[PDB]
């Protein structure tokens, strides 16, 4: 089922609305305002009877030189005897690098003015720095946290969101593997991203980490939570892992990814160095944000203004729409403001280029649209997308703090949402590889004919017609087959077919992987992959790896060799989408330029369509065919307008070079493979060609000269290193007797061939 939302007004919502009408504050100076001469503290809490500032030398009581300094009484901000809801004090002198908490004595929202008070110690709601484990805030000069050349670091923004290629990455996963070639100190840390010239096992043969990303050519890296989360003990062991969907401090970097979580400035500088390194690599940084819930209701929000910041049921229970125990009340004036101010902070202070909203379905449409407008004032190329669903039933008031009707930012309400707030298309996801809820379930690539309609509607970003949900335009659609949640693409292929064990190479499974690649990059919308999808990433069948072993979760960098051909295929498919404007369109101007051979809703083993282009200097027409049959199929296009074709992607390779020609309207499409072709006239005139070198790898029985296994194609930049390997799937009764050509070397302009010659063998042991 899809979870429900309910409009219910009660004592709590009416109390919160009254608080907004009187005390809503837009002053822009809540938290700490540092200067060398003085530091000013501001806390918003209309429910409070008193607020006390506590100063410490260190962020925890374990550290050397840790001591309580003193405590101070904050005073109400009055004008002509009228309180604006804000507490303030100004400390004269130099207070930088001191740590602090607030002691808030307060009622709840439904008992303001009463003697029913409780006192809570808490970090600042508007913390820009904390000590270890985010318990104590830190007074910092943010200038001191700027790395070398930070002033010259610019945003990396896509001209159009639909021109993106997103690599969804977890910071520990990136470099926790020793084979990553990243230094001992920086493995699984922010600073891993700053290490150039890293290679597999540091042997200097093939690129890893940042150099690998430059070669792959992804436009965008989306980072899993690097705001401060609860679920990793920052004073604990290095082997701890969590995705970090457990927020504690929204505007403070995560401590565990830094080299030193005790000094609050170090993580800020190192977090900025990561973002700079990615910007220097020409890559856009998208931040996974989780305003929909906090780890617990024992939070800075609840301790400051009890029952204001969370959606309250009539029974006094916290609404659990997140499935994590609570949901943030985005409809409230001061959380709306907090969220928007937070987004602007990460953009301006950390140079973040966009956001992925966790459970965007829990966040109200008005708030989301206002956030889009705010970020537009900085730059409208700043990207926004999110999950158009919740994680449970959500109880909200009828209206927002503005007096407009509450609407959740779900798939169902895509029409009410800005067309530049994109939504994850679970339609094409389930269409391609099968239900995400069931690892054993088949989609189109595994041979489901019923799944074809999922793919076919996905091809135009679910923006043409209606199947499941409808995007306003391709700009409002994220096109993907897998993410960090549920099974990896290759794990679902393995589980659903039983072709092999998890993480084991299988020729037919890899064919299916290549086909998924073809679909993603011949589909409209914002193309998105899990980091390592291109190298057949496995989690050993883990369908919820959020707190699983770090070595299970980590990117196995050996896969860039083991699946170098698959990486090469993705690398080439990315080039195709980038070269052909209809695929990267933001609007619906190309919707009526598609000619599907069969009905879009057809149950078929072969999907085919043509796309008419209108951009001068590009290809005039593209033909796309997906064949999920176990045999080769002759597919005849219904569109006969073009009868001279150049093939640019097949079962073997993909890219901008001609792989052969086709006369007429009929194409022979190999089993479990795609064909991408373009009009010959256009291919000649456009002058679009590859600058990448090729290596063909053959596997031959020496005695007969016959192939034991299909040849594969590696592709990469001329001068970049490659490593070929003997085929993993060849029976154990054959052994490599001899190698022809350069098994290892650098790509050249001319294609090189490597042949692994095999002889008769009996394992024995």
Ligand X SMILES: OC[C@H]1O[C@H](OC[C@H]2O[C@H](O[C@H]3[C@H](O)[C@@H](O)[C@@H](O[C@H]4[C@H](O)[C@@H](O)[C@H](O)O[C@@H]4CO)O[C@@H]3CO)[C@H](O)[C@@H](O)[C@@H]2O)[C@H](O)[C@@H](O)[C@@H]1O
Q: What are φ and ψ of residue 374, in 5° steps?
A: -60, -45
Does residue 491 interact with ligand X by CB under 6 A? no
Instruction: By CB under 5 A, name the one of 5, 108, 228, 387 that touches Ca ion.
Output: 228
Task: Output helix, strand, coil percentages for the chain, rounded to the nearest 5.
Answer: 25, 25, 50
Residue 546 binds to ligand X (criterion: CB under 6 A): yes
Binding footprint of ligand X, residue count (CB under 6 A): 14
Q: Which option in Ca ion, Na ion, ligand X, none does residue 228 bind, with CB closer than 5 to 8 A by kind?
A: Ca ion
Edge-to-edge strands of the sheet including 38-44? 31-34, 38-44, 82-92, 75-79
- Nearer to ligand X by Cβ, of 502 and 546: the residue is 546
* Beta-bridge partner residues of 608: 625
- Minimum distance, C-beta of residue 243 to ligand X, in the bound complex (Å): 6
Q: How many residues bind Na ion (CB under 5 A)?
A: 1
How many residues appear in the chain? 765
**Which residue number has the CB closest to ligand X?**
358
Q: How far is CA 234 from CA 97, 123, 131, 251, in A?
A: 19, 17, 10, 17
Distance in angstroms (rounded) separating the CA atoms of residues 273 and 253: 12
Residue where the block lists tokens 């169902």: 412
Q: Does 202 bind ligand X (CB under 6 A)?
A: no
Q: Least separation, in Å, of the C-beta of 132 and Ca ion?
A: 8
Nearer to Ca ion, 249 or 476 (CB): 249
**Rounded Cα–Cα distance for residues 266 and 555 (Å):** 26
Residues 236-255 that bind Ca ion (CB under 5 A): 255
SS3 label, residue 387: coil
Distance CA 513, CA 633 (A): 19
- Candidates 391, 434, 454, 582; binder of ligand X (CB under 6 A) is 391
The listed partner (ligand X, Na ion, Ca ion, none) that binds 331, CB under 5 to 8 Å by sort, is none
Q: What is the DSSP letter of 551?
A: H
**Of the candidate residues 220, 322, 581, 610, the single one contacting Na ion (CB under 5 A):** 581
527 in contact with Na ion (CB under 5 A): no
**Degrees, nearest 5: CA angle 389-126-286:** 45
Report the alpha-carbon distance of residue 239 to residue 176 in Å, rounded: 9
List all residues 6 or more positions away from 403 whose beta carbon is below 8 Å from its beta carbon. Answer: none
Contact range with Na ion by CB under 5 A, out of 59-67, 450-458, 573-581, 686-694: 573-581
What sign results for the dihedral spanned by CA atoms 461, 464, 469, 473? positive
Site string for Ca ion, 180-219 (x = CB under 5 A): ----------------------------------------
CB atoms within 10 A of CB 39: 21
- Is 123 or 581 the residue whose CB approaches Na ion more closely? 581
Binders of ligand X in range 317-376 (CB under 6 A): 322-325, 358-359
Tell me the closest approach of the beta carbon of residue 579 to Na ion, in angstroms: 6
Tell me which residues in 255-274 interact with Ca ion (CB under 5 A).
255
What DSSP state is assigned to residue 576? H
From the centroid of its chain, how far is CA 734?
43
SS3 state of residue 45: coil
> Does 575 engage in binding with Na ion (CB under 5 A)?
no
Min separation Cβ 356 and Na ion, Å:
25
Q: Is 243 among the residues that bind ligand X (CB under 6 A)?
A: yes
Binders of ligand X among residues 456 to 485 (CB under 6 A) are 485
Phi–psi pair at 530, nearest 5 degrees: -65, 140
Looking at the chain, the residues that come just before a C–N gap of over 2.5 A are none
- Whole-number minimum distance, CB 765 to ligand X, in Å? 42
The CB-of-32 to Na ion minimum distance in angstroms stands at 47
Alpha-carbon distances of 614 from 187, 581, 589, 682, rounded to whole Å: 48, 9, 10, 11
Taking the complex as a whole, how short is the minimal distance between the CB of residue 89 and Na ion, in angstroms?
Answer: 57
Q: Is 173 in the site for Ca ion (CB under 5 A)?
A: no
Q: Which does 246 bind (CB under 5 to 8 A by kind): Ca ion, ligand X, Na ion, none?
A: ligand X
| Segment (H or E) for 334 | helix 333-350
Instruction: Give 479's Cβ-side CA count (13 Å radius).
Output: 33
Q: Residue with CB nearest Na ion?
A: 581
Q: Taking the complex as a whole, how short is the minimal distance between the CB of residue 434 and ligand X, in angstroms?
A: 19
Stretch that binds Ca ion, among 37-45, 220-228, 594-602, 734-742 (CB under 5 A): 220-228
Query: C-beta of 221: minimal distance to Ca ion in Å?
Result: 21
Q: Could you give the residue ranges of the DSSP H alpha helices within 434-539? A: 452-458, 489-497, 507-520
Cβ 745 to ligand X shortest distance, Å:
41
- Residue 509's binding partner, choosing from Na ion, ligand X, Ca ion, none, with beta-carbon cut-off 5 to 8 A by kind? none
Least separation in angstroms between residue 228's CB and Ca ion is 5
DSSP strand E in 108-232: where?
A: 118-122, 137-138, 165-169, 220-223, 227-229
CB of 338 to Ca ion, least distance (A): 19
Stretch that binds ligand X, among 242-250, 441-449, 567-575, 624-632 (CB under 6 A): 242-250
In whole angstroms, give the CA distance from residue 480 to residue 493.
15
**Smaller CB separation from Ca ion, 255 or 682:** 255
Spatial contact of 550 and 239, defined as CB atoms under 8 Å apart: yes
Of Na ion, Ca ion, ligand X, none, which one sits near residue 387, judging by CB under 5 to 8 A according to partner kind?
A: ligand X
Tokens for 580, please give them: 């052909």
Residue 387 near ligand X by CB under 6 A: yes
Which residues form the interface with Ca ion (CB under 5 A)? 228, 255
**Binding interface with ligand X (CB under 6 A):** 243, 245-246, 322-325, 358-359, 387, 391, 485, 544, 546
């Amino acid at each position: 089922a899809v979870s429900s939302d309910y409009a219910r007004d009660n004592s709590y919502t009416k109390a919160a609305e009254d608080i907004d009408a009187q005390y809503a504050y837009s002053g822009n100076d809540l938290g700490v305002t540092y200067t060398k001469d003085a530091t000013t503290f501001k806390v918003w809490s209309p429910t409070a009877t008193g607020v006390k500032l506590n100063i410490f030398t260190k962020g925890s009581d374990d550290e050397q030189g840790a001591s309580k300094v003193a405590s101070y009484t904050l005073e109400k901000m009055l004008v002509d005897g009228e309180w604006n809801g804000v507490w303030t004090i100004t400390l004269v002198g130099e207070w930088k690098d001191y740590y602090y908490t607030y002691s808030v004595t307060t009622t709840d929202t439904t008992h303001i003015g009463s003697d029913a008070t409780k006192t809570y110690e808490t970090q600042d709601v508007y913390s820009t720095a904390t000590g270890v484990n985010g318990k104590r805030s830190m007074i910092v000069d943010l200038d001191e946290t700027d790395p070398e050349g930070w002033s010259n670091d610019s945003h990396v923004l896509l001209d159009k969101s639909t021109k993106s290629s997103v690599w969804e990455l977890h910071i520990k996963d990136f470099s926790y593997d020793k084979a990553s070639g990243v230094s001992d100190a920086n493995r699984g840390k922010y600073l891993a991203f700053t290490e150039n010239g890293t290679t597999l096992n540091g042997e200097g043969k093939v690129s890893t980490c940042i150099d690998y990303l430059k070669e792959l050519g992804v436009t965008t890296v989306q980072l899993n939570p690097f705001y401060d989360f609860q679920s990793v003990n920052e004073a604990g062991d290095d082997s701890q892992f969590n995705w970090g969907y457990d927020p504690v401090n929204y505007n403070v970097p995560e401590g565990s990814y830094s080299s030193n979580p005790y000094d609050g400035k170090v993580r800020i500088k190192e977090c900025k160095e990561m973002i700079k390194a990615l910007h220097d690599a020409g890559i856009s940084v998208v931040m996974d944000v989780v305003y929909n819930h906090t780890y617990s209701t024992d939070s800075c929000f609840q301790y400051t203004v009890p029952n204001y910041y969370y959606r309250m049921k009539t029974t006094g229970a916290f609404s659990d729409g997140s499935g994590c125990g609570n949901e943030g009340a985005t409809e409230r004036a001061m959380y709306r403001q907090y969220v928007i101010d937070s987004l602007k902070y990460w953009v301006n202070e950390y140079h973040v280029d966009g956001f992925r909203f966790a459970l965007m379905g829990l966040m109200d449409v008005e708030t989301m649209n206002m956030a889009r407008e705010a970020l537009d004032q900085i730059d409208p190329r700043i990207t926004m997308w999110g999950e158009g669903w919740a994680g449970g039933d959500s109880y909200h008031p009828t209206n927002t703090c503005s007096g407009t009707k509450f609407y959740p930012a779900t798939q169902a309400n895509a029409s009410r949402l800005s067309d530049r707030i994109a939504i994850f298309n679970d339609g094409i996801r389930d269409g391609i590889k099968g239900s995400a809820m069931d690892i054993s379930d088949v989609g189109f690539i595994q041979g489901s004919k019923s799944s074809a309609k999922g793919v076919s509607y996905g091809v135009r970003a679910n923006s043409s017609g209606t199947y499941k949900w409808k995007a306003q335009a391709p700009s409002q659609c994220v096109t993907y087959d897998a993410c960090h949640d549920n099974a990896t693409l290759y794990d679902q292929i393995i589980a659903s077919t039983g072709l092999a064990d998890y993480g084991e190479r299988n020729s037919e499974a890899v064919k299916m992987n290549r086909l998924a690649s073809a679909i993603i990059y011949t589909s409209q919308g914002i193309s998105f992959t899990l980091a390592g999808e291109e190298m057949a990433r496995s989690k050993d069948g883990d369908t919820n790896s959020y707190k699983s072993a770090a070595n299970l979760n980590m990117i196995k960098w050996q896969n860039v060799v083991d699946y170098a051909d698959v990486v090469s295929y993705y690398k080439g498919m990315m080039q195709i989408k980038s070269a052909f404007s209809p695929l990267t369109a933001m609007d619906n101007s190309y919707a009526d330029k598609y000619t599907f051979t069969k009905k879009v809703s057809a149950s078929t083993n072969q999907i085919s369509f043509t796309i008419q282009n209108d951009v001068e200097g590009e290809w005039n027409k593209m033909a796309v065919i997906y064949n999920n049959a176990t045999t080769a199929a002759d597919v005849t296009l219904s569109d006969t307008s073009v009868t001279d074709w150049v093939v640019i992607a097949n079962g073997e390779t993909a890219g901008l070079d001609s792989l052969g020609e086709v006369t007429g309207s009929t194409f022979t499409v190999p089993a479990r493979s795609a064909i991408v072709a373009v009009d010959k006239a256009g291919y000649e005139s456009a002058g679009i060609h590859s600058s990448k070198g090729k290596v063909k790898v053959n596997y031959v029985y020496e005695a007969t000269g016959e192939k034991l296994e299909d040849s594969v194609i590696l592709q990469g930049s001329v001068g970049s290193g490659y490593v070929t390997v003997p085929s993993a799937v060849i029976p154990d009764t054959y052994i490599v007797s001899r190698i022809g050509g350069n098994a290892e070397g650098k790509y050249t302009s001319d294609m090189q061939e490597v042949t692994y010659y095999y002889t008769d063998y009996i394992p024995e042991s």
